[PDB]
Design an enzyme around this catalytic site. Sequence first.
Site, PDB file in Angstrom:
ATOM      1  N   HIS A  57       0.871  -1.206   0.000  1.00  0.00           N
ATOM      2  CA  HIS A  57       0.000   0.000   0.000  1.00  0.00           C
ATOM      3  C   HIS A  57       0.901   1.247   0.000  1.00  0.00           C
ATOM      4  O   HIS A  57       0.362   2.344  -0.144  1.00  0.00           O
ATOM      5  CB  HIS A  57      -1.123  -0.073   1.064  1.00  0.00           C
ATOM      6  CG  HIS A  57      -0.762   0.249   2.486  1.00  0.00           C
ATOM      7  ND1 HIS A  57      -0.678  -0.725   3.476  1.00  0.00           N
ATOM      8  CD2 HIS A  57      -0.541   1.434   3.112  1.00  0.00           C
ATOM      9  CE1 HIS A  57      -0.373  -0.154   4.627  1.00  0.00           C
ATOM     10  NE2 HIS A  57      -0.292   1.183   4.442  1.00  0.00           N
TER      11      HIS A  57
ATOM     12  N   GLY B 183       1.291   5.814  10.730  1.00  0.00           N
ATOM     13  CA  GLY B 183       2.722   5.625  10.407  1.00  0.00           C
ATOM     14  C   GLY B 183       3.275   4.266  10.825  1.00  0.00           C
ATOM     15  O   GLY B 183       4.453   3.955  10.506  1.00  0.00           O
TER      16      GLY B 183
ATOM     17  N   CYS C 179       2.339   1.206   9.986  1.00  0.00           N
ATOM     18  CA  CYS C 179       2.291   0.118   8.971  1.00  0.00           C
ATOM     19  C   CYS C 179       3.726  -0.313   8.706  1.00  0.00           C
ATOM     20  O   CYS C 179       4.506   0.586   8.344  1.00  0.00           O
ATOM     21  CB  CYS C 179       1.656   0.527   7.650  1.00  0.00           C
ATOM     22  SG  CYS C 179      -0.072   1.064   7.774  1.00  0.00           S
TER      23      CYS C 179
END
Lengths: 306, 306
Positions: free
Chosen positions: B41, B143, B145
């Site tokens: 992503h 933030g 991820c």
Amino acid sequence: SGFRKMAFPSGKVEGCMVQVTCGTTTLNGLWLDDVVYCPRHVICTSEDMLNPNYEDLLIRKSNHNFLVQAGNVQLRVIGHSMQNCVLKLKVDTANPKTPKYKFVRIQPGQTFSVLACYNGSPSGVYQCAMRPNFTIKGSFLNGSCGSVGFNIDYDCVSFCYMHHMELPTGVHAGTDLEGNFYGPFVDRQTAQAAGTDTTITVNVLAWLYAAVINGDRWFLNRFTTTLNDFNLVAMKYNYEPLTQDHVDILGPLSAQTGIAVLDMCASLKELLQNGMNGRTILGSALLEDEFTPFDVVRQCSGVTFQ
Amino acid sequence: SGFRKMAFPSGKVEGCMVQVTCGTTTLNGLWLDDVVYCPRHVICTSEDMLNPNYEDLLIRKSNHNFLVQAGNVQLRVIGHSMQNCVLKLKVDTANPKTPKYKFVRIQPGQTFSVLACYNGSPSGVYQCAMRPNFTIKGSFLNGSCGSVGFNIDYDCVSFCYMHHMELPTGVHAGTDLEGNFYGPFVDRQTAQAAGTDTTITVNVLAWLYAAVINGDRWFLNRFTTTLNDFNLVAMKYNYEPLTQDHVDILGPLSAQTGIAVLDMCASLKELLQNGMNGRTILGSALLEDEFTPFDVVRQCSGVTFQ
């Protein structure tokens, strides 16, 4: 979002852990520059721990009777100074892995991460709080003496704790890194009375701010109160006295949530008196007291380290 | 003694964390040998996350549009392979700090340590459990991820989790390190239904063994039961079905305590039905389910690492 008992990354601490031996007795040490800090009870036998005289025992002892493995690296000792209840062993090699550090002495109610070690090998890491009576309620097995507690500031490691003993009550006592115990405890095997414990009110009020931030509203009330009035209720429930310096410290969370400290005390007051009755606050059915306001701020607003 | 939610030392993991950037979008990666694993992503914008087509997006993208800071060291990318929902970025340099590792795929009910990172910088470490519905109830801010979950075996790091998204319910989903999500989740911004959650009965029975070991006796009963009978009570309380493979696994703790699994079920059965009524078990007023039998064994009998 969500909310968990988070501990500091242990990387910077794992490479200061070494293994200290002396007679049979073996436990953990901390290696920083040319020095190994450890509990001085290392010189003692099972029989010695009953009524030990550190001087007369320390004096039958010179460098070459102190092993100091650092994995498989062998440090050699050239000197040995007793400083209160810690021992400072000086060694030929200096730690390439030495962080930017400092020793400090914390106050009842502040939190640190603990790195539990056996034979200078790290086995796990948890967050815990110095209780008002200067004990900690930790997890330590036989061999864990010399494990340390620490906070991290971007680059800087504060060392605030070294584990020295379990009490008969199954709670833990120990010293700062200058070797002065926390609380009225001595490094000797006898019944040592602790002290009445108390709930840390500043940390519990921080815990409720964390809850509102995270969607936990139900306990917010239509009522209110003053300081001197609230303390009164906090007396009969064994909570600590809240003060001005605690309204000051808690100010930033009041600014974020938009709930004035005293509108928050009014919620707690009600909680003490009527209880929780089958109800949870961030999946817990009693009032959590091991998160300082500083902890909640840095978990609800993310923080870089290293 | 005592007993705490302990997490693994994070040392070995902190030096595989790096920072990945691509367009604006920036998050965490894992660097092992010559490769950086991260959530794909990363290639997406805020507008893209609504209905993203990974192929058509991945194809407007070549190496020199992927930053990869590793503190201040600058890695350069020469290749880029999509593998399911992770992305494998190949780089000129190889990680001097690469542990003896392996990827694995765990089962609902097993526990791991999570190292929450922002900009490839570690900020904290907690223990949590994969829930039966394949979510985790963690602590992640915007933030986070690309943060990872892991178990440690003396020398060997098992990587079992990479953080991909928060759901509208404020629980966390993510993938194995081969890029296959846990559960029915996709890497897309839409309402994703989770599933009924359940209490992990094998872990709760382990938790009660930990309690007896540690002096917590009061809940041990003069009654008893059989398996098929107990499950019945566990049905109406949303506990998982206990089986033979769980009596097997729990055998060693039965050997230590000298309490047969079924004499332990008989205690729990009673607890479900009559509740705790103002009573704590290892300072907790509900039935803890995030400690496998393996966890309790290694905390109640000390374990070297590294």
